[PDB]
Amino acid sequence: GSMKYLNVLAKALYDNVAESPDELSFRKGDIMTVLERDTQGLDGWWLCSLHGRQGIVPGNRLKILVGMYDKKPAGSGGSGSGLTDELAPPKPPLPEGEV
């Protein structure tokens, strides 16, 4: 397939609840494939693919995992237990419908 997209991996720093039909819902720590950023002219919204579903994601809750640099893992377990409040930043706004 023609690579019309960035196809990079990004990690969720916070979870997300999809409120729009275009949006992806995921958990903190999940990995999604970023296809483009500022998609549809929606500044701050990043088009990604997760579980075979495509959709926009608030970029300020995502971290591009730039694979230009080697990094060894910490190995410090993986329970992901939120034992304290980890309040997420607000998502950017959206327009009055698809143009």
TrEMBL record:
SH3 domain boundaries: 6-67
Localization of this protein: Cell junction, Focal adhesion; Cell projection, Axon; Cytoplasm
Superkingdom classification of source: Eukaryota
The family this protein is said to belong to: Belongs to the CAS family.
Protein name: Breast cancer anti-estrogen resistance protein 1
Taxon lineage: Eukaryota, Metazoa, Chordata, Craniata, Vertebrata
Gene designation: BCAR1
